[PDB]
Backbone:
């Protein structure tokens, strides 16, 4: 291992409210 | 080769080009996480080993 990680919808989407 | 073939010896080798040799600091050599168990075994006693 060489160290490598990340935090990981067809029907529209943007909804931060 | 053939029925006139001369006596012979065998020679053996390998190549491993773009690689780097690895030795994981793990209680067994599998990769079970980025922070290995040996890397978190001896945070108990100071350690400071040469």
Residues:
């Amino acid at each position: 291992n060489f160290a490598s990680l990340a935090p990981r919808r067809p029907f529209m989407g943007t909804w931060n409210e | 080769i053939g029925q006139t073939a001369v006596p012979s010896v065998t020679q053996k080798k390998f190549l491993c080009d773009r690689v780097m040799w690895r030795i994981p600091f793990s209680s067994n050599f599998m990769s079970m996480g980025a922070l290995t168990d040996l890397g978190q075994n001896m945070l108990y006693a100071n350690s400071a080993h040469a």
Observations:
- DSSP finds no helices and no strands in chain B.
- The CA atoms of residues 17 and 23 of chain B lie 18 Å apart.
